[PDB]
Amino acid sequence: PASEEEFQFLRCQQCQAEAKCPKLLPCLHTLCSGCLEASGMQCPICQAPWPLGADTPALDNVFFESLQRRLSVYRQIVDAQAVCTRCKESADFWCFECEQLLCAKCFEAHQWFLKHEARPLAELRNQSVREFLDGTRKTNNIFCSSIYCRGCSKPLCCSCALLDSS
Amino acid sequence: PASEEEFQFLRCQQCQAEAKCPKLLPCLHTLCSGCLEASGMQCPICQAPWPLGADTPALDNVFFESLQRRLSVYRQIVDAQAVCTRCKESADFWCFECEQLLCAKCFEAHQWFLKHEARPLAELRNQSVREFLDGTRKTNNIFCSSIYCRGCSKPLCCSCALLDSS
């Protein structure tokens, strides 16, 4: 399994992320990428350590999709698509062209902001970089209501400067 | 000519750059990308408006290769390779794997800093994004003596914060 090694690089749990440690975050402190996953980013409930189940490997909660959006921010600035890593990731059935979201409402929000960051099927198959460059230059949009952040719920080029910690 | 349109996007003159205007620069003010090309970035000589010839379309001067390095910074953070745009760009004969430099000494410097940002032939042919992601995560190096800047002549993740204007 060639592309299977892409996540074995970190033994990721049904997710994909190239950076083992973000140099900055909207949360309190920079730590191992799994630290904010081991315990919810902003969830004060006893479910924050996901004793009942984690959302990123399988949809569990809307607030725990904050982790999904956190990973999706990095995948938006530069996309380490899990589909190329794992074409079986299409089991979600690809409701929309943007990755690292679920329940169709984060997708609908990316649409509301006309800020899809769509990874087309041609991009999912990893055969081109022209569309990648297009999406990259589009990372800085000129419309609103640059890339989404749930805390403020608005496009922000890098909410790391905000330190939202919603 | 499919890939020929990539530079016709801006009618570029024997060069490649996706951003028609950098949102920030090490120079004085943000302007059209051609403004700093019409007149040298830091050259006070009467040759700054390249009446004798421009360096970016064809090697003319070492100080005018500051433009080459400026474009190469953007192409390093995200690479709009002219080779995919124009496979004839290999006429340089590909002395080394990094693009947007000449005279082999900027290349030797990228090597000195163990900071090649090499675009392998597999990447030149535009068939993969895994090596791109590798080089991207390597954009932030852990060695020195992150990406080169001639003014200080040292790796800088974004010399825009420095406003070098050497």
Author numbering:
A (entry chain A), B (entry chain B): 46 to 190, 201 to 221
Show sentences the authors wrote.
Within the nucleus, this 70 kDa PML protein molecule has the capability to assemble into a super protein complex, known as PML nuclear bodies (NBs).
After multiple rounds of 2D and 3D classification to eliminate heterogeneous and incomplete components, we determined the cryo-EM structure of PML46–256 at an overall resolution of 5.3 Å, with the core region slightly better resolved (~4.4 Å). Unlike other TRIMs, the RING, B1 and B2 subdomains are folded together, centered around the PML α3 helix, resulting in a PML monomer. The current cryo-EM structure revealed that the PML monomer, which serves as the basic unit for assembling PML NBs, forms a functional PML dimer via two α6 helices. Additionally, two SUMOylation sites, K65 and K160, are located on the outer surface of the dimeric PML46–256, giving ample space for PML SUMOylation. This suggests that the two PML CC helices following S221 might be positioned on opposite sides of the PML dimer, resembling the arms of an octopus.
